[PDB]
Amino acid sequence: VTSAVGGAMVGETVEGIARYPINLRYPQSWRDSPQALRQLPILTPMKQQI
Amino acid sequence: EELDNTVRLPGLANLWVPPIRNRIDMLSTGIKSPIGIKVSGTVLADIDAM
Ligand SMILES: [Cu+]
Numbered sequence A: 001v002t003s004a005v006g007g008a009m010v011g012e013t014v015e016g017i018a019r020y021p022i023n024l025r026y027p028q029s030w031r032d033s034p035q036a037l038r039q040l041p042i043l044t045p046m047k048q049q050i
Numbered sequence B: 001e002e003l004d005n006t007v008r009l010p011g012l013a014n015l016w017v018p019p020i021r022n023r024i025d026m027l028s029t030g031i032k033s034p035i036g037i038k039v040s041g042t043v044l045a046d047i048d049a050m
Helices: A034-038 B002-006 B019-027 B044-049
Strands: A011-015 A018-022
16 A cells, blocks of 8 residues: 555666656556555465455 | 985875975865866766866
8 A cells, every 4th residue: 555556665766966766556547446445456475366 | 305316116206295284285175276167067977078
């Protein structure tokens, strides 16, 4: 929820003097409605589909 | 003069100064030449070629 449906920063790309953020999140199709979040797939460490 | 004429090794350009003046000049991180042109940029290659 902080990254997939979020978009929290994970790092900065450096280009000479400039620094640009790097994002990380799922597509928008999994962000529209609460019903779309109720079905947000998660891969538990047990390698199962929940 | 005798000091300068005695110490001679390849790869050195001798300077004989007072200790206090030498320390002041070492801590003085400014520009010594009469006129100075500062070219600033975002990367090193452009300002060097400029
Ligand atoms: Cu020095």
